[PDB]
Amino acid sequence: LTTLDVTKLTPLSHEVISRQATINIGTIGHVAHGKSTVVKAISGVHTVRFKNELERNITIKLGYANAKIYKLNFKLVRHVSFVDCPGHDILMATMLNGAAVMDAALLLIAGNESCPQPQTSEHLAAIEIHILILQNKIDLVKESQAKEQYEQILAFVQGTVAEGAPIIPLKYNIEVVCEYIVKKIPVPPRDFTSEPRLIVIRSFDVNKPGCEVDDLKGGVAGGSILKGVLKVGQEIEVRPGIVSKDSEGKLMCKPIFSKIVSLFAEHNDLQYAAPGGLIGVGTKIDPTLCRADRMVGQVLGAVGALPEIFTELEISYFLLRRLLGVRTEGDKKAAKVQKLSKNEVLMVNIGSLSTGGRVSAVKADLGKIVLTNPVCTEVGEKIALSRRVEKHWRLIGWGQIRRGVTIKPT
Amino acid sequence: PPLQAVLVADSFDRRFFPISKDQPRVLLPLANVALIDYTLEFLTATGVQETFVFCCWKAAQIKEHLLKSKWCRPTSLNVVRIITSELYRSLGDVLRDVDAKALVRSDFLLVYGDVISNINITRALEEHRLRRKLEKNVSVMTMIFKESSPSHPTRCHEDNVVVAVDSTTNRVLHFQKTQGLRRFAFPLSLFQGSSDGVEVRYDLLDCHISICSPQVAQLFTDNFDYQTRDDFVRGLLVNEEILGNQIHMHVTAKEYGARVSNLHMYSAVCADVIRRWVYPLTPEANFTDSTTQSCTHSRHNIYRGPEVSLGHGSILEENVLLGSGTVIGSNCFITNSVIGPGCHIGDNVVLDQTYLWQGVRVAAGAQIHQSLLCDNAEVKERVTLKPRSVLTSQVVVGPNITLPEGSVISLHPPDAEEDEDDGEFSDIKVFQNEVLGTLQRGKEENISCDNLVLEINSLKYAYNISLKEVMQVLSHVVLEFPLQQMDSPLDSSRYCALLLPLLKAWSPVFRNYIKRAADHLEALAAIEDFFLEHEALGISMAKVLMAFYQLEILAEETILSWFSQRDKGQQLRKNQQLQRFIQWLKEAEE
Secondary structure (H helix, E strand, O other): OOOOOOOOOOOOOOOOOOOOOOEEEEEOOOOOOOHHHHHHHHOOOOOOOOOOOOOOOOOOOOEEEEEOOEEOOOEEOOOEEEEEOOOHHHHHHHHOOOOOOOOOOEEEEOOOOOOHHHHHHHHHHHHHOOOOEEEOOOOOOHHHHHHHHHHHHHHHHHHOOOOOOOOOOOHHHHHHHHHHHHHHOOOOOOOOOOOOOEEEOOOEOOOOOOOOOOOOOOOEEEEEEOOOOEOOOOEEEEOOOEEEOOOOOOOEEEOOEEEEEEEOOOOOOOOOEOOOOEEEEEEOOOOOOOOOOOOOOOEEEOOOOOOOEEEEEEEOOEEOOOOOOOOOOOOOOOOOOOOOOOOOEEEEEEOOEEEEEEEEEEOOOOEEEEEEEEEOOOOOOEEEEEEEOOOOEEEEEEEEEEEEEEEOOO | OOOEEEEEOOOOOOOOOOOOOOOOHHHOEOOOOEHHHHHHHHHHHHOOOEEEEEEOOOHHHHHHHHOOOOOOOOOOOOEOOEEEOOOOOOHHHHHHHHHHHOOOOOOEEEEEOOEEEOOOOHHHHHHHHHHHHHOOOOOOEEEEEEEOOOOOOOOOOOOOEEEEEOOOOOEEEEEEEOOOOOOOOOOOHHHHHOOOOOEEEOOEEEOOOOEEOOHHHHHHHHOOOOOOHHHHHHHHHOOOOOOOOOOEEEEEOOOOEEEOOOHHHHHHHHHHHHOOOOOOOOOOOOOOOOOOOOOEEOHHHOEEOOOOOOOOOOEEOOOOEEOOOOEOOOOOEEEOOEEOOOOEOOOOOEEEOOEEOOOOEEOOOOEEEOOEEOOOOEEOOOOEOOOOEEEOOOOEEOOOOOOOOOEEEOOOOOOOOEOOOOOOOOOHHHHHHHHHHHHHHHHHOOOOHHHHHHHHHHHHHHHOOOHHHHHHHHHHHHHHHHHOOOOOOOOHHHHHHHHHHHHHHOHHHHHHHOOOHHHHHHHHHHHHHHHHHOHHHHHHHHHHHHHHOOOOOOOHHHHHHHHHOOOHHHHHHOOHHHHHHHHHHHHHHO
C-alpha cells in the first residue's frame, strides 16, 4: 500500500512518494483494436476500473491507463500513463494543440507488412512531436521476422530524418520494452506551481439507483490535469459551468464552484493530485449538474482561471493540402482538404477541449468559427480544426486564436 | 410514464420562398387552419401530455398566433412549452438544446410543425418499449412510414424515400432518397449481418413522426456534424460497431400521415384533407374551437361556412370549401378548391385546384387554374391564370395580363420572379506531381517553411520513397517550377530570375531535405540532370551553382567534388561560365 499524505510543499515529477501519476506515454500506431491489448499486457486487464457508464464518445475521448513499472519485493519509482485514444487523428489533434501533451510517443508497429496505417502513424507522430517503436506481431518465423525487421528498419531510416531512432523487434518482450521505456524516456518538465486546471474528458455518477438519503455521492468528474497541483478541500472552479439559454437569446454560462471532497484515481489516491494521469475528482456537485459525460468539455480551474467562455472564436485558418499520411491505392481526390465553406461543422480540439463549431465567416486568412458549446482555453492558444472525412473525425488544419467574444455570468 | 414531444415549428429549408418572408410555413392554412394547429391536434389525439415547441424565425408571430388557440388554455390536457432562441438554426441544434436543458425523460416524440396526420401510435410505442426492455436500451429511434404507391402525387420526386429494412424484426438497415438518382446503390454488410431476412421498400411515404429515445439527443450532442434527421440516420447506419443504436420502423396502412415542403405537397395534402383522408381531422368538425372556422358538410365534399351569399348560376361540383363571409357572384364555377374567409368573387369565373386565402378579391371574368393566392390579394378583370402560379400577400394583377406557367410574384423583387402593381408591366511520377502541386500551393498561398516541410514529410511518408529519391524529386520539382514561369523563352535570364527567389524562399525546405554530404551529391547530380534537360537556359546553370553555395544548400566541398567528377555532363560543366563560377567560389572561400 502507498504511504502518501497531505504534507507537501514542492513535489517533483519523478517523486516516489505519490506513485499514482508521474508521466504520460502516448501511443499512436497501426493497432486496429490492438493497442488496448498491449496496454493490458503492459499494465493490467482489469486494473483500471473506478466508475463505468454507457460509452458516449468512443472515438472522441482518449483513454488513460496507468502502469507502475517497478524494478529491483520490487521497488516502484516512476509510473507511465498509457494514453490509447481511438483513432490516431484524435491523439494528433490533442498533442499538436499546445504544450505538455503526449510526452512519450509509442509507435505500435506491426511485423506483418508495411501498410499505409504505419505511414499515417508515422505522419501523426511527426505532426505531434521521443518515439518508441515496438513490433507487436509476435510468434513469427525467424527469417520472416528478420526480413520484416529489415523492412521496418528501412522504413524507420526514412523516419530517422525526423524522429526514428528507437529499436525493438510475449511477456518477456513486454518486460524488455518496459525496461527500455524506463531507461530511455526522461522526466518531462511539468508546472506544479500554477493553478490546477482539470480538463474533464469523461464524467461519471457515483450514486447508484435507489441509494440512501444520506449516502449520496454527487459529481465524480474525471479528466486530465494540465498544470499545477490539486489538493482535497480546495474549491474547484468549473469555468464553462451551466450554460442556460432561458433569457431567449444569447446563452449565459454560470460558473459553478464546488468544494473538492475527494480526489479518487483508479486506486485509492491521496489528497494531493499531480498531472499526467486520469485524475478523478469527486466534488460537492449535484448529480443533475454532472450526469454521464454531461460536464465534459469544462475546464475545472482552481483559482479562477482567466479563460472566459467564448461563443465565437476568430482564428487563423491554415488548412493542409492533403491528409497527413493517408494515401490509399486509388487516391481519387480523397486526400484533398477543401476550403472552409460557410456553415460547415468543424471539430476544434483546443488542447483537450474538443468542441464543435460552425464556420460563420472567413476572409482568406481567418475563420470566425461560432462554437456550439462554450469553450474556455486561452486567448491565443493553438487551436486545431478537424473534419469528418468518411465516418471518422480527421485533422484538417491548425491555427492561432486571434479574436473572441467572451461572456461570464454570475 | 408521461409522454413528451418536441415540435420543430421552423423547418430550416428555403423552399416556401418568398411565402415564408411574410409568415412562417407552419402558420400557412390548408383549409383556414394553420399547420401547427393540425400538428397539435394530432399530438393531443395521440395522447401526448406535454409538448416542446421550438421557433426560430418570426417566432413572435407564431407565439401570438398559438397563444389564443385551444392548447394554451388552462382546460387543455396537452400543455405546451414555448421555447424560442435566436441562436439555433437546425434540428440538431434543437435536439442538443433539449439535451442541454434535459426536458424529456424517456420515449419522447419528435415531429415537425407542418405534419398532417391522424395516426394513433400506441402500438408503435408498445413495440418500442418492448424492444428497449428486451435489448436493454439498444434500439433508439422508431421511425414511422405510411404504405403508399410510388406513383401517388403526395410523394414527390424531391423526397421519395427508399429504405432497406428487415421484415422479421422491423429494424432499419439502409435509408436514402431519390434526389436525382436513376440507379440506387445498396451496401452488402446488411445481408451478412442479418442472414434471417431482408427486404427493400420503396412503398414508404415518410411522415416525419419519428418517435425517439433521449439517446438521439445524446448522439446529437456528440456528433456536431449531424445537421438534420437523414444526416443522423445516414451517419448511424454506416457506423454500426461504433455507436450501435439500431433504428426500428413502423408501417401504417389504415391511417394518414404526411408533411409539406412544396406547392405539390401542399396541394396534395390539402386535396387529401378536403377529401377527408385525415378523418377525424376534418374542417367541418372544427377541432380548433373557433366560430370563424366552423363549416357544414354538403354532398360531394362541399364545405359551406356561415353567411356565404351564393349567387345564381354559381355551381360547386367537387371538393369546395367556403370560409366565413366569402361573397360569391353569379355564374361561377368552383371545383377542387379552398376559399378563405372574407373573400370577394366576381362573375363568370372558373377556379380549379386553387387555394384562395383570406381577404382576397377576384373580379369578373377571371380564370384561375392550379394556383395559390395568399392573404389580402386582388386581381382585376380579363385575367387568366396558368397552373403553378403563386400570388403572395396583396399582389395586384392588372387587366389583359396573362401569367405563364412558372409564375411567382411578390413584393420582394429578388426572391420572386417580379413585383407587380396596378399595372402588371413593371509510382515516382505521382509523388513528383504531388510535390509540384504542394510547391505551387505553397507559392500561391505563401505558406511557411514549417508547414511546407511537414507537407513534404507527409508526402514522403505516403509515397514511401527513399530519402535520396525524395531529394532528387524535390530538386526536379524546384527545377520544373522555375521552368514553368517561362512558356517558350529559351533564355537564361527568366529561368535564373524564377530560380533565385524560389531557392531564396524555399531554402529551409531544401536544407531539411538535403542535409548530408551524399544528399548534397545527389542534389548536384539532380542539378546536372536538370541543366542537361534545360540546356537552352544552360547559361543559368552556373548561376544556380553560385546560388546553392549562397543559400547554403550545396557546400563548397560538394561543389568541388561535383566539378571534379566527370561525358556530356563533364563537357557541359567544362564551359566558361561554370569555370568562372568555380573560380569565383574558390576566390570567395579562401
